[PDB]
Design a protein around this ligand. Structure first.
Ligand code: FMN
Ligand code: SF4
Ligand code: SF4
Ligand code: SF4
Ligand code: SF4
Ligand code: FES
Ligand code: FES
Ligand code: MG
Lengths: 431, 59, 62, 217, 42, 230
């Protein structure tokens, strides 16, 4: 079976590109804020079942069943408040979808927050938006004010008797505060260093209360799933990879953009259709990073026949991640690009725990020596081993994600590294 | 490699090399070395007493 | 140098049990003082207590 | 890449606990509005918004400002110092009137971000971490700013200028130094993240309310 | 009409737009829960 | 009721909420640690105490992971040994070569656990990190190039002594421990940070350079400076 060629009548995120009104009047002109009271009266179990049938997976990196997570938070109350934290710290390089959703579909985001809060029995929803997105945060606040004035959220939300608050928390610059436990720590006015698990956020979250952290895209697609079916959402995509997805195609491509497509569209077709293809044509392709910095890269051979899907990319020794497709053509320094990614991880490391802190600095130094050839061929395996020592021995997943691009570079472009080292040795021995 | 009479060396600038680390005192088989140290006037880690009993040393 | 006149200044003996040590001391005739072994008491540790909703165990830093 | 900024404080006449700083009455109203976004008994959660407000009022964060925030929120000044030194958007040193931040990560590096940086350096005659003699412009490099598809891009006082070329960034700098406020957004004729050639999706009018609503819902 | 950028309201914001909106939203909120103590250090 | 856990296949009954480290302690095995102190809170950031559960693909932090029913804790497994070697490699990669001029010397946990649980060789071919030394009074001498960022002094300061003038400033590999200002950590319980620091970063200033741990003779007496009788 073939996937892709999504129809505008089925694309969830209308008003993308900001060609229409993003206010409450415009959002209500589309399907937003329709029978929300009826959904709330249907209640938590109905919403959870609908999400589980739709088979939605986490859209902000690691893809876990959102139905399972929200059911985890669906435990009975114990005398403590309940919070839904919506992650909007779009710090992963290559990713712009959350920015587009916040800037052009803020009422969709707010309705999704209300629906998720009803599903989880949450009194409040804190939308943690990164501090660079000042205008996006202001648009979100204006949309929240319009919703409150219209009575859609607040006390007796949508005329359903459910009391729900929506606060917007602007963070500072911290790709680590992008993480869920670091998100929780920064909301509490602390440094923003990830916690250990257990306790899980669904058990002890922000302020020590049960919280559920969900991505902006996930919460935004929740109310459309509720109003529509979820058999429909499951129909779009593969068997265990259902729904639509926002892809940010960027890099050495003709028409970099953000688009919405199905969950199993082949990478080559997506690049050739929605981006105009590589600048020098498909024969000029060198490598593609399909999920932002965290996911490894794949060469042209793998990209020739590969599906932009969770399992399809996992089978290719990669990951879907945030569906950020960075394209590199033949006329690029792949070693320098990976060194720049590792330098990014060095700057954004929170420094709490020894493996990531020390090892990421060490890998940055080794890569910086690699890009100029000032190394030996025996250091490639040493770099592989130290990257394997960082992965799985850290508190959070930033350390794991700082080793995967290195592993991908070593796995697919070892001849380039060896050639550069040999060239440097010849250049220096001529003195 | 000949092992004869002992000596305490200096850096080319004239500073004494010994830093009162007491590794020689720890490793001496015959316990011939007695070292006592304290911070110097300039704050360096230097010895005030460094004795070797050459009748106890086994060279 | 530091001098001494006590033959038994550096003498330390190792025993597996208090009863063995006391038996040795008694048969060799020296007086002895026995000190009971001190073991740390078990302590309840929890990482989740660092983020209590209403208790004072919440930490201000990490 | 060395950061170049220390994380220890040496008292100076321009930066010491006796430096005068106190919030305006309007900012005190804003503080009391921010404080009640969090449960009672958790006032320490407002450290980041209050510190950001202090920075927005004063232009940067003197140690007196940090102490004032700590006093207002009844939190330890060491905790405030931890937050301030941890988060990079807080200026613990005076900056220029316009704080240019050029993104240099890989998605922006694949496009000519180095050309943008070089054009800014030549236009202003300053290095990559210095300030203009007239205290008007400061230039730094930063990591991904969330506008990768519109690379290369810079941020100048919470405004994104995207799809930049050396000519465009020079024009923006000229407009800033003249006195005008340039319009933020792409400079390549695009309005937003849409593909440059034309809309490959969302070409038809959106469907109205209740298009494919479930039978029961 | 699908050819004009309608998100043009953001070429007017100032330094205190976000916090002023937050002040305006203060009226519509609901009473915050309490931990029973004024501070973790109390 | 007590739950049954297994350490290297040996059964042991522990109360629910007991950590892997405490279960191994009950069976008599002391797991390596740097940031864990039983008198302080659980931090779990040095990552030295990682152990392998028999069926778990991922190693767990022994100092913070509560035991579940029927867990087999493989303390001396290949994964555990490799985890310890990696963590020790990172620590000694950034540490300075100050052992002979260091008061910690022969009573250093970094040295002992490096000799017992780490490798015997170094793969670090880069430059090291040097950190400016802070001043916190006349009692404690700080040489912060030797710090391993275990945050014991921070947790002790706040929790035990009620003084919140210690913390971490900055982030990444440039993370530093200090007051961020010229402030003296003067308290009636200051030398205990000298005791709990596993490395020579915090050392006694009156005791500086005078002796080495192996020379000294230990006499067990009591204290007469106050009526507590320490
Ligand atoms: C915008 C955003 C940024 C994230 N950044 C990070 C990060 O830096 N490190 C990390 O380990 N996880 C990161 N995550 C993943 C979170 O830890 C967590 O998995 C996610 O927020 C949960 O959302 P989901 O249920 O929709 O997947 C990020 C997630 C989002 C949405
Ligand atoms: S892995 Fe890195 S970013 Fe994550 S907790 Fe450890 S030091 Fe912080
Ligand atoms: S104490 Fe002994 S081993 Fe140490 S520096 Fe002095 S002479 Fe050398
Ligand atoms: S702290 Fe330990 S490992 Fe470091 S210099 Fe001192 S004795 Fe050596
Ligand atoms: S100074 Fe010592 S106790 Fe404090 S964090 Fe560093 S190593 Fe730990
Ligand atoms: S890489 Fe520059 S905006 Fe993301
Ligand atoms: S002792 Fe457990 S991570 Fe430090
Ligand atoms: Mg010490």
């Amino acid at each position: 079976t073939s996937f892709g060629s999504l129809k505008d009548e089925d694309r969830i995120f209308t008003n993308l590109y900001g060609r229409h009104d993003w206010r409450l009047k415009g959002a209500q002109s589309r399907g937003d804020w329709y029978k929300t009271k009826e959904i709330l009266l249907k209640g938590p179990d109905w919403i959870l079942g609908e999400v589980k049938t739709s088979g939605l997976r986490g859209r902000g990196g690691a893809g876990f069943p959102t139905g399972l997570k929200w059911s985890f938070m669906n435990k009975p109350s114990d005398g403590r408040p309940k919070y839904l934290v919506v992650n909007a710290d779009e710090g992963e390089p290559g990713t712009c979808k959350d920015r587009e959703i916040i800037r052009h579909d803020p009422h969709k985001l707010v309705e999704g927050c209300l629906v998720g809060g009803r599903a989880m029995g949450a009194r409040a929803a804190y939308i943690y938006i990164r501090g660079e997105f000042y205008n996006e945060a202001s648009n979100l606040q204006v949309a929240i004010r319009e919703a409150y004035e219209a009575g859609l959220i607040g006390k007796n939300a949508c005329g359903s008797g459910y009391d729900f608050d929506v606060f917007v928390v602007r963070g500072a610059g911290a790709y680590i505060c992008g993480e869920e436990t670091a998100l929780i720590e920064s909301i509490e006015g602390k440094q923003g260093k990830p916690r250990l698990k257990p306790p899980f956020p669904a058990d002890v979250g922000v302020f020590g209360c049960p919280t559920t952290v969900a991505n902006v895209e996930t919460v935004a697609v929740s109310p459309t799933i509720c109003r529509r079916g979820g058999a429909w959402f499951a129909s779009f995509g593969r068997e265990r990879n259902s729904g639509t997805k926002l892809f940010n195609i960027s890099g050495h491509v003709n028409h970099p953009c953000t688009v919405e497509e199905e969950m199993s569209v082949p990478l080559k077709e997506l690049i050739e259709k929605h981006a105009g293809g590589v600048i020098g044509g498909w024969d000029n392709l060198l490598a593609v990073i399909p999920g932002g910095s965290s996911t490894p890269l794949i060469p042209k051979s793998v990209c020739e026949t590969v599906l932009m899907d969770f399992d399809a990319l996992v089978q290719a020794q990669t990951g879907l991640g945030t569906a950020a497709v960075i394209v590199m053509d033949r006329s690029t320094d792949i070693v320098k690009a990976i060194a720049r990614l590792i330098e990014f991880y060095k700057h954004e490391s929170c420094g709490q725990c020894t493996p990531c802190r020390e090892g990421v600095d060490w890998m940055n130094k080794v890569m910086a020596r690699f890009v100029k050839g000032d190394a030996r061929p025996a250091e490639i395996d040493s770099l592989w081993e130290i990257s394997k020592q960082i992965e799985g021995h850290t508190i959070c997943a930033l350390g794991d994600g700082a080793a995967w691009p290195v592993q991908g570079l070593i796995r697919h472009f070892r001849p380039e590294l060896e050639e550069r080292m040999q060239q440097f040795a010849l250049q220096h021995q001529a003195r | 490699r000949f092992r004869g009479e002992h000596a305490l060396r200096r850096y080319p600038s004239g500073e004494e090399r010994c830093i009162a680390c007491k590794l020689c005192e720890a490793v001496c088989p015959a316990q011939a070395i007695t070292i006592e140290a304290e911070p110097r006037a300039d704050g360096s880690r230097r010895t005030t007493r460094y004795d070797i009993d050459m009748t106890k040393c086994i060279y | 140098w530091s001098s001494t006149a006590d033959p038994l200044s550096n003498l330390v003996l190792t025993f597996s049990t208090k009863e063995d040590a006391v038996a040795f001391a008694e048969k060799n005739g020296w007086s002895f003082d026995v000190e009971e072994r001190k073991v740390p008491k078990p302590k309840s540790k929890s990482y989740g207590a660092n983020f209590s909703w209403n208790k004072r165990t919440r930490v201000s830093t990490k | 890449g060395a950061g170049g900024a220390l994380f220890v404080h040496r008292d100076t006449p321009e930066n010491n606990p006796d430096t005068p700083f106190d919030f305006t009455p309007e900012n005190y109203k804003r503080i009391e509005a921010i404080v009640k976004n969090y449960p009672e008994g958790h006032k320490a959660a407002a450290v980041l918004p209050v510190l950001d407000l202090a920075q927005r009022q004063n232009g940067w964060l003197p140690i007196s400002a940090m102490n004032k925030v700590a006093e207002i929120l009844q939190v330890p000044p060491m905790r405030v110092y931890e937050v301030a030194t941890f988060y990079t958007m807080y200026n613990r040193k005076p900056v220029g009137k316009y704080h240019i931040q050029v993104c240099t990560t890989t998605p922006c590096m694949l496009r000519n971000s180095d050309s943008i940086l070089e054009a800014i350096q030549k236009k202003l005659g300053i290095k990559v971490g210095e300030t203009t003699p007239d205290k008007l412009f400061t230039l730094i490099e930063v990591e991904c700013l969330g506008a990768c598809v519109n690379a290369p891009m810079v941020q100048i006082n919470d405004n994104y200028y995207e799809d930049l070329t050396p000519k465009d960034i020079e024009e923006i700098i000229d407009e800033l130094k003249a006195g005008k406020i340039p319009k933020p957004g792409p400079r390549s004729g695009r309005f937003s993240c849409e593909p440059a050639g034309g809309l490959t999706s969302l070409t038809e009018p959106p469907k109205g309310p209740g298009f494919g609503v479930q039978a029961g819902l | 009409d699908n050819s004009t950028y309608r998100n043009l309201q953001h070429h007017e914001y100032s330094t205190y737009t976000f916090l002023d909106l937050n002040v305006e939203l203060s009226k519509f909120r609901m009473p915050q829960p309490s931990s029973g103590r004024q501070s973790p250090r109390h | 009721n007590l739950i049954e856990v297994f350490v290297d296949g040996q059964s042991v009954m522990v109360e629910p909420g007991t950590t892997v480290l405490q279960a191994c302690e009950k069976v008599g095995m002391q797991i390596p640690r740097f940031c864990y102190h039983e008198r302080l809170s659980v931090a779990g950031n040095c990552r030295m105490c990682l152990v392998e559960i028999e069926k778990a693909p991922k190693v767990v932090a022994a100092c913070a992971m509560p035991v579940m029913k029927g867990w087999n804790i493989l303390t001396n497994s290949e994964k555990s040994k490799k985890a310890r070697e990696g963590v020790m490699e990172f620590l000694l990669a950034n540490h300075p070569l100050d052992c002979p001029i260091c008061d910690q010397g022969g009573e250093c946990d970094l040295q002992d656990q490096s000799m017992m649980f780490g490798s015997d060789r170094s793969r670090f071919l880069e430059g090291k990190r040097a950190v400016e030394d802070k001043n916190i009074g006349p009692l404690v001498k700080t040489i912060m190039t030797r710090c391993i960022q275990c945050t014991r002094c921070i947790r002790f300061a706040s929790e035990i002594a009620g003084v919140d003038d210690l913390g971490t400033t900055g982030r990444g590999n440039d993370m530093q421990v200090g007051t961020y200002i010229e402030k003296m950590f003067m308290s009636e319980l200051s030398g205990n940070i000298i005791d709990i620091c596993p490395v020579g970063a915090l050392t006694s200033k009156p005791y500086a350079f005078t002796a080495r741990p192996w020379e000294t003779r230990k006499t067990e007496s009591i204290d007469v400076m106050d009526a507590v009788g320490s």
